[PDB]
Write a protein that binds this ligand. Structure first.
Ligand code: NA
Length: 741
DNA sequence: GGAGACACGGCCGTGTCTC
């Protein structure tokens, strides 16, 4: 199968490289006659020759329009006549782009920002990750003692053969390979990768830590960090605001971005994520404990176990998600490296671009939400279930032909009109998106049929994934319509789908209350929470599953709902803000928790203690008491200043800042005194009492003296503690005035 | 090419997630 595409430059000409795994072997095929191009709409076709004369400079090399060919395409369901302009190198596009548009005869340009290797996949009809090839995979993690200043203590890895650890101190455990030095540890890990020859290297946050650290130690220790199959090092790319790492010939599959896009929980640690997916706790050994262990030589077995489990948990996490991302890559028609790192929004973009090319539909340029909100029931509810609405929206798009090319169409015999908002949509022909959405579902059902028929357990799990991948993709179109940088953006399309949704949501809530006796506690654009007052947990589950079968029978065709989970209890504050606890006593908040370094520990600690009293123990009055004592204690100067420190990172040169927050005020005073302030530096400040802007009163905690300085009790009460609990407790009829001392 | 989900200090710009 096709694993990735890139290009290389030979004699100024782009050469496409197609990385493949066919018949068990890894091979790189090449293509030398694929040409970059853009499109251009001209006011006057006579001017194409002068447009062909437009030049530009690229590293002092002359860039020009090599060829021009007139082409008839369709733009948003209407014929359009543009000029396809060819070039020599893909790097010519951004050098000459704007001069072609700046030309007075050229109205605009189209398909001018499509990466060359992706353009290739689309145009040649190539689908990555397709077919029957078992890919070999290896997980790995590191343990480290300025970035990459200290040495790497351990490198763990895991696969089918098991999970081992490489360290440079003698640890008597069977899975621990003991090596002489850190350099030889890294070198030993390089051998194992080249020897196992995996197709996929799995990591957790390897884009922003593992690889980069490994680079800088190998940079310092004089090792050439070769993981690429052709002999290259890992390339650290830049994805706008963040970094990312490719390994040529292999697929670096970082689990972190995938997981955040897939599931929803407050803290995205390796243990939390593993606990949410596999329902088993994992011990976390902290960085203060590791240094202590490595320094003395006391507890290196526990540190070595933690590193081994890190590798093993990552591999089995890798085994769960990769097949799904594999399938999404086949549907979208882009590499797993890209699809694994994209937003749901951009997954729909690349799907639509590929389909646009197949139907000869010219792509619109980039520019470069909202929904149902029932006010929830108040207080703490026993035995809650969540049912998902998202499945409604694709069928709504399909049935009502909702598309930008069908919006307010001129001169049709049939129209479906949206409720409330009143937008119209043509019915004489099927829209671009709706017909594509229709086929995604028709394919999903055809997959489900063949799924049940086939009994090969491995292919029964493979076809299960394919169907699941179509669901994630189909469920993304609704959101994509209102996506900010969306090519096929249409606010009317979204409002309309929302409007038509209300009916089915209303009807669903109506049925579940009357025919089944539930009370809906919270309902939003995505789903709703519900219970049966006075009922046992098992009844609720049983009755909920009975409702699912009923409602999906009544809602025509592919109109569906899903049963997501049961929760022992919860409360509900406002839109997208609630908290729940499952039968395993695992708390799950949305839009409430504040577990971040820019909030003080006292605020974090008190909130967590409040969520515990309410959810695990069911004592709201104890939660109120907790906050009362804390606010009393803050004002009496009994809370340790260590719990009051705010950590905040400066992210570029101090001169760049257009607006000064507290941490930028603290940093600028340090810089005025010569003290090192670089991007990445972390200001840890505390707020002293008195007058002035918070920034004027804030000092560094290093410069803090408990005896001399007096922190700002009012600030930590009113701006930190109370804001973190007020909202939660407001859903129980408690106001700020009830919480202060 | 290159997310999003959503806060608060100060007069929307900026930061946090992971490691
Ligand atoms: Na122009």
């Amino acid at each position: 199968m096709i694993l990735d595409t890139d290009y290389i430059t030979e004699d100024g000409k782009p050469v496409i490289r197609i990385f493949k795994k066919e018949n068990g072997e890894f091979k790189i095929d090449y293509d030398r006659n694929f040409e970059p191009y853009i499109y251009a709409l001209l006011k006057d076709d006579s001017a194409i020759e002068d447009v062909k004369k437009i030049t530009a400079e690229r590293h002092g090399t002359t860039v020009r329009v090599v060829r021009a060919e007139k082409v008839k395409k369709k733009f948003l369901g209407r014929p359009i006549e543009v000029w396809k302009l060819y070039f020599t190198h893909p790097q010519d596009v951004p050098a000459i782009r704007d001069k072609i548009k700046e030309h007075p005869a050229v109205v605009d340009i189209y398909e001018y920002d499509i990466p060359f290797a992706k353009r290739y996949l689309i145009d040649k009809g190539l689908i990555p990750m397709e077919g029957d090839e078992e890919l070999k995979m290896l997980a790995f993690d590191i343990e480290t003692l300025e970035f990459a200043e200290g040495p790497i203590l351990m490198i763990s890895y895991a696969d089918e053969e098991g999970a081992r650890v490489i360290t440079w101190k003698n640890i008597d455990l069977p899975y621990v390979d003991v090596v002489s030095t850190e350099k030889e540890m890294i070198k030993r890990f390089l051998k194992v990768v080249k020897e196992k020859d995996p197709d996929v290297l799995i990591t957790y946050n390897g884009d922003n830590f593992a690889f980069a650290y490994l680079k800088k130690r190998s940079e310092k220790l004089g090792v050439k960090f070769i993981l690429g199959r052709e002999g290259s090092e890992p390339k650290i790319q830049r994805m706008g605001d963040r970094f990312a790492v490719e390994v040529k010939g292999r697929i670096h599959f970082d689990l972190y971005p995938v997981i955040r896009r897939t599931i929803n929980l407050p803290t995205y640690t390796l243990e939390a994520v593993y606990e949410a997916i596999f329902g088993q706790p994992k011990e976390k050994v902290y960085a203060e404990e590791i240094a202590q262990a490595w320094e003395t030589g006391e507890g290196l077995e526990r540190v070595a176990r933690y590193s081994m489990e890190d590798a093993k948990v990552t591999y089995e996490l890798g085994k769960e998600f990769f097949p799904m991302e594999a399938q999404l890559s086949r549907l979208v028609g882009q590499s797993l490296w890209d699809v694994s790192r994209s937003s749901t929004g951009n997954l729909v973009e690349w799907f639509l671009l590929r389909k646009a090319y197949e139907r000869n539909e010219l792509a619109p340029n980039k520019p470069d939400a909202g929904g149902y909100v029932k006010e929830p029931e108040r207080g703490l509810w026993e035995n809650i279930v969540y049912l998902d609405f998202r499945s409604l929206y694709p069928s709504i798009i399909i049935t009502h032909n909702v598309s930008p090319d069908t919006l307010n169409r001129e001169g049709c015999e049939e129209y479906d009109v949206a409720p409330q908002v009143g937008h119209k949509f043509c019915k004489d022909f099927p829209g671009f998106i709706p017909s594509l959405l229709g086929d995604l579902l028709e394919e999903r059902q055809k997959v489900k049929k063949k799924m049940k028929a086939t009994i090969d357990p491995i292919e029964k799990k493979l076809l299960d994934y394919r169907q699941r991948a179509i669901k994630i993709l189909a469920n993304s179109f609704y959101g994509y319509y209102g996506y900010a940088k969306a090519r096929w953006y249409c606010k009317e399309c979204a409002e309309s789908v929302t409007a038509w949704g209300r009916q089915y949501i209303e009807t669903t809530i109506r049925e579940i209350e009357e025919k089944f006796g539930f009370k809906v506690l919270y309902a939003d654009t995505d789903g709703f929470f519900a219970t049966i007052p006075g009922a046992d947990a098992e009844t609720v589950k049983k009755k909920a599953k009975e409702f699912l079968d009923y409602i999906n029978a009544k809602l025509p065709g592919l109109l569906e709902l899903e049963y997501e989970g049961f929760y022992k209890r919860g409360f509900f504050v406002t839109k997208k803000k609630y908290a729940v606890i499952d039968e395993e006593d695992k708390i799950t908040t949305r839009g409430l928790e504040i577990v971040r370094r820019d909030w003080s520990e006292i605020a974090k600690e008190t909130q967590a203690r409040v969520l515990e009293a309410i959810l695990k123990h069911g004592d709201v009055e104890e939660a109120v008491r907790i906050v009362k004592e804390v606010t009393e204690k803050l004002s009496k100067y009994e809370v340790p200043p260590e719990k009051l420190v705010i950590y905040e990172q400066i992210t570029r040169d101090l001169k760049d800042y257009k607006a000064t927050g507290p941490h930028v005020a603290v940093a600028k005073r340090l810089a005025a005194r010569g003290i090192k302030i670089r991007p990445g530096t972390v200001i840890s400040y505390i707020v002293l009492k008195g007058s002035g802007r918070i920034g004027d009163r804030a000092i560094p905690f290093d410069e803090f003296d408990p005896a001399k300085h007096k922190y700002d009790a009012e600030y930590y009460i009113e701006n930190q503690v109370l804001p973190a609990v007020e909202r939660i407790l407001r859903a129980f009829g408690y106001r700020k005035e009830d919480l202060r001392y």
